[PDB]
């Protein structure tokens, strides 16, 4: 009801309106400032006029952090999984090191393209595969 | 004792200066906080401590210093 009493919506904040009347054009679009002033009037602003972001977790602000978080998690899992499987397939090529320096382009592309299913292959390797390794089979230093 | 009369305006002084390198400008600059001689102003809040503790005269601080000499002994 009265949550975040220190902040007000950017449309209801006069400083934000005054500043958005003079927002600067970003690209070649002369309305880039106008469209930015129209898009940022949605969020909550502070007394100065700049929008504050809310990561509290509520789905009213699901775009402030939740959606970029999901997108980056997907893409970074893709990168990590394709790189890991590329390194593991490299492990069995007699000369793995010089293929780690000189990138096998076809194998790398085949690993990369088949990366859209990383979150499923991950649990596939976790359930009974090679994702996690036993501690006693890992080289360590003296204690 | 002067600081207790007006704590919000009088700045507390740690101790006096005695430096032969000083010139007239430095002497005039460091004769501050209503002191007749060059002095450094305190910045450790020990004045507020001693006042809130109940010490109101110089003789109390003096006897405390002497007693602490005895404690170190």
């Amino acid at each position: 009801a009265d949550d975040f009493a220190n902040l007000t919506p950017c449309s209801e904040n006069p400083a934000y309106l005054a500043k958005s009347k003079n927002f600067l054009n970003t690209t070649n679009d002369p309305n880039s400032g106008k469209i930015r002033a129209e898009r940022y009037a949605s969020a909550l602003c502070g007394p100065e006029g700049y929008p504050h972001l809310i990561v509290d977790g509520r789905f009213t602000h699901a775009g402030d952090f939740l959606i970029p978080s999901i997108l980056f998690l997907y893409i970074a899992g893709w990168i990590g999984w394709v790189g890991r499987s590329y390194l593991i397939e490299i492990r069995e090529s007699k000369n793995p090191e010089m293929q780690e320096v000189v990138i096998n382009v076809p194998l790398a592309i085949k690993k990369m393209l088949g990366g859209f299913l990383w979150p499923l292959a991950a649990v596939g390797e976790y359930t009974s595969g090679k994702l996690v390794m036993k501690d006693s089979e890992i080289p360590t230093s003296p204690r | 004792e002067q600081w207790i009369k007006d704590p919000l305006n009088i700045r507390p002084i740690a101790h006096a200066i005695w430096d032969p390198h000083f010139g007239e400008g430095a002497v005039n600059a460091f004769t501050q906080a209503g002191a007749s001689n060059p002095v450094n102003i305190a910045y450790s809040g020990v004045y507020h401590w001693f006042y809130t503790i109940g010490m109101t005269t110089n003789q109390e601080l003096y006897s405390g210093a002497v007693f602490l000499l005895v404690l170190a002994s």
Partner: protein, 38 residues
């Protein structure tokens, strides 16, 4: 340099003593002790 506080003659000679006599004496004693026996 002066002092409206009592015994203002004490820093007069006490500042050179803490700054010249005491350091020279302590440094000389410690120097002799560092280079003792041989």
């Amino acid at each position: 340099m002066d002092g409206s506080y009592a015994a203002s003659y004490l820093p007069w000679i006490l500042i050179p003593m803490v700054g010249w006599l005491f350091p020279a004496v302590t440094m000389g004693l410690l120097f002799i002790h560092i280079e003792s026996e041989g």
